[PDB]
Ligand binder design. Structure first.
Ligand SMILES: NC(=O)CC[C@H](N)C(=O)O
Ligand SMILES: NC(=O)CC[C@H](N)C(=O)O
Ligand SMILES: NC(=O)CC[C@H](N)C(=O)O
Ligand SMILES: [Mg+2]
Ligand SMILES: [Mg+2]
Ligand SMILES: [Mg+2]
Ligand SMILES: [Mg+2]
Ligand SMILES: [Mg+2]
Lengths: 443, 443, 221
């Protein structure tokens, strides 16, 4: 435990906290919350604070149902930018049913369940090193989003010189004050695109920071007159944004993926992991790329995964394996994007991985040769399947996979499919300007 | 023969024709042409006029290849609106290879081939009574299309009162002077939507008029400061435009679909026809609804076919059977839209129909009960398949059907698939404003 | 002060959720929640049952007070989690009366028809009146209607103990004028002026010609 209930009570008093937000996540990955005055902390730490848990299902909810809110004192943070008049602190919580049992529809819960499957397999911890990317746009007069990019930097360039702005720097500084240990940041390929990578951390913790990260990024960015977005592909023709996930399984406190003696220094356990993700990849894409626009990023020519395959060095493998070895040995899934629900994304990935480990699934041969120059036919002969091209396709596949479906839970699954299904329908029944610019006069 | 070569030469001289357009259609249904001075008529009637036939493949062409142009004197027409300075006449032609043989890539040819399959089956003629719908929009200052509709009329209302405009009336009048025998016209369901129905006519002739019709509509409409469009679904939320096709097979000069003694007065031949279209419907949709936007019209709630089924009276059956019987006995396919290539659409329909007749395919039971209130599950139990939801799906199905594929010709098929395939890719890799209005801020 | 404008208007925007001011009620006898009952169906004492009966009886009658404005009824429309029919449940799309999960001294009856435009004191007067009317007369509470009312035909909906709330301010006012206890719940002087205020108010709204009317009739006719 990082914070005992006394440590908190003393922290709220000393730091003069005046506002406490009890945040959590819904099925769509959206960051939700229920704010209480500092004079409510007591009932909060007592887990007696209630709320309409049907809000977890998002815009699919049908009837309100009372649910409890159990704060996790380890996630206690104090937002530094808020000050004077009143300091604001948060508390990521766990949703609990009125009777006292965990709500099966809560994503953060689903992750723990899958993580419990991992421990029952002999594994200690499951780390995650995310690489969330995002774009920053300018705000107009009314303070609305615009297609105007904040800068014109390239991949790894000295983005926004150290002026009074440099939103990317400022975010990293704010995160550091909040206790966020960041690895490094840099300007991304496309103009106005940025990236900040964290140090590895346990599953639930890493996902907790991904949620808090987006919040901080969007917040600080709005203070700088900018608008931050984790939309997979905002602008056509330019690079999209992904949130690559470096995973590593630990056993007895040792990277179970490292095998110095083995070729590429990758142990049998690690190779089976790969097989797992390779077998379920096309099936968990609906989760790791939950939006319609997510698939506008999954197109060739922008360094984003399009076919299921892995290597050490390639134009853009679905699964990449970093150079560093030893305790850093890890497998990187590059298909995931920042729009994905961090908790639901790990749940599915871990399940795909743990699947191969248990069933000793055999991993295919790496693909180091350029795969983007091969035809769909030539791709088959080599056993290279393609990822789903649309949310619709990703949904049919996801429903075909028994393990991936069980990786979310009957409740969560049911709602996820319902929401996305409606999402797609709206999109498909819609008539976009492109269709008019292309057919209005031609026909 | 309607016009002997002498009749033409005398008509061009007497009517002082100064400009002759040798029109034809490409694979995309687009109306193409090659205009010649009246002083070129000779070489024209001699079928010695050449052109780059690779233009028939549309934006897919790769290398130019000389091809001949054989005018059909029966299609000779004189556009009435053009006058004074110089009168203009047209001549729908047939594309012929340099050696003298018909080009397999010409749609109008494909239709004759399929029609030859019909005659070799004992049938005399194959009629077609189209019902093309279209919208008229206003032109701005620069004379560009706008989303502003010409009127606000409803279904069968007294559209645009008899003023100096009334574009719908004026088109019908112009067509009548050109020798177009129209059945009737009326204002359609959606505002600014119009419909004009012709009298039945042979396959090639009816398709010839559908091509000429669009030309006349778009032309006259532009004279009235309006902009005509046969785009399947211009505006979201409002009705789309279809081009229902009333078909009827003739044998020895008698409607082979009529059987007074038989129930519903429909002969065995007619019922087998239905079976044919019901079996290939999901497969020929890629042809009858060739554009991406075509599927934005194939959505429920706008009186447009969404499931394969037929009846005498329903909310919107794929196949409808008009009341009138006897020589008028006919089957109406309501899935087809005006964006479809008239020639390629008949080719496929006729093949689907002739398929059932030859193989004596058994027709399913009519569906008179409301089908739009049933679930996808409840739909299955009743054996009601759904039409393709996107151009992508329609293409995979079309390629699965051996008969439908052979209904177009190896050459035409190959090019059609290539073009549409590219069409879809552009559309899918595109990032529409809708996606941004929905994700930009949410993520 | 924030360059903004707060509004408690029941329904300021069409096709968007309206604002309601749900009222969680709870009666105490001798400093003890008279609505809680350890060993009882759904852990709800008789007094609580009777209170629910009293509200269900005068629900259609006190609507005029809890929804005093004309706009208050553009909120009372299906599809926006706002009460549209008289019924009490614990888990439903949008019941008029709801009984939250928690029990003990937290046992309460929630009335969701009330909106923020209502006069707090007057709203409580009729609500409490109706609730006491049920306890004093030990009115029998109807069966809790779970299921889903927002899909039942109107006939069917009526075949069961389910009536829809007043459609307009006028409809509500007439009903209110026929309910003796509801009338005696405000007071001769309050009731008088209230009815006057709303009738004069409603009349203004009924004689007005809205843009919607011209958009729909100016050309079609
Ligand atoms: N290095 C990178 O940023 C590649 C990932 C890519 N930006 C996605 O999509
Ligand atoms: N009567 C009709 O116009 C129905 C067909 C419809 N307008 C299509 O789509
Ligand atoms: N509590 C709710 O979510 C209900 C909200 C709704 N606007 C009322 O009525
Ligand atoms: Mg990157
Ligand atoms: Mg990376
Ligand atoms: Mg019509
Ligand atoms: Mg019709
Ligand atoms: Mg409430």
């Amino acid at each position: 435990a990082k914070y005992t209930r006394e440590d908190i009570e003393k922290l709220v008093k000393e730091e003069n906290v005046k506002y406490i937000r009890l945040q959590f996540t819904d099925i769509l990955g959206t960051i939700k919350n229920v704010e209480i005055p500092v004079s409510q902390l007591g009932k909060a730490l007592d887990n007696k604070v209630m709320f309409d848990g049907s809000s977890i299902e998002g815009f699919v909810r049908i009837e309100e149902s009372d649910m409890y809110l159990y704060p996790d004192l380890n996630t206690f943070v104090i937002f530094p930018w808020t000050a004077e008049k009143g300091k604001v602190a948060r508390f990521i919580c766990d949703i609990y049913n009125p009777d006292g049992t965990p709500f099966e529809g809560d994503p953060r819960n689903n992750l723990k369940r899958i993580l419990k499957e991992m421990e029952d397999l002999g594994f200690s911890d499951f780390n995650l090193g995310p690489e969330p990317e995002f774009f920053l746009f300018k705000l107009d007069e009314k303070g609305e989003p615009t297609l105007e990019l904040n800068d014109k930097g390239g991949y790894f360039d000295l983005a926004p010189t150290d002026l009074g702005e440099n939103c990317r720097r400022d975010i990293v500084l704010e995160l550091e004050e909040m206790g966020f240990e960041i690895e490094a940041s840099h300007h991304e390929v496309a103009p106005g695109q940025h990236e900040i990578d964290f140090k590895y951390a346990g599953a639930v913790r890493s996902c907790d920071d991904i949620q808090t990260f987006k919040l901080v990024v969007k917040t600080i960015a709005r203070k700088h007159g900018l608008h931050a977005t984790f939309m997979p592909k905002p602008l056509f023709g330019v690079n999209g944004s992904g949130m690559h996930c470096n995973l590593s399984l630990f056993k007895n406190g040792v990277n179970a993926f490292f095998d110095e003696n083995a070729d590429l220094q990758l142990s049998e356990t690690a190779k089976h992991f790969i097989a797992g993700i390779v077998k379920h990849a096309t099936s968990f894409t609906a989760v790791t790329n939950p939006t319609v626009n997510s698939y506008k990023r999954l197109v060739p020519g922008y360094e984003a995964p399009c076919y299921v395959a892995w290597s050490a060095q390639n134009r853009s493998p679905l699964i990449r394996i970093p150079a560093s070895r030893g305790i850093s040995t890890r497998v990187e899934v590059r298909s995931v994007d920042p729009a994905a629900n961090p908790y639901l994304a790990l749940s599915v990935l871990l399940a795909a991985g743990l699947d191969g480990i248990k069933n000793k699934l055999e991993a295919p041969a790496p693909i180091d040769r350029n795969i983007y120059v091969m035809s769909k036919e030539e791709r088959m002969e080599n056993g290279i399947v393609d990822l789903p091209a649309t949310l619709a396709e990703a949904l049919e596949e996801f429903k075909s996979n028994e393990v991936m479906v069980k990786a979310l839970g009957e409740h969560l699954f049911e709602h996820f499919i319902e929401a996305k299904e409606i999402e797609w329908d709206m999109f498909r029944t819609q008539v976009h300007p492109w269709e008019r610019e292309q057919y209005m006069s031609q026909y």
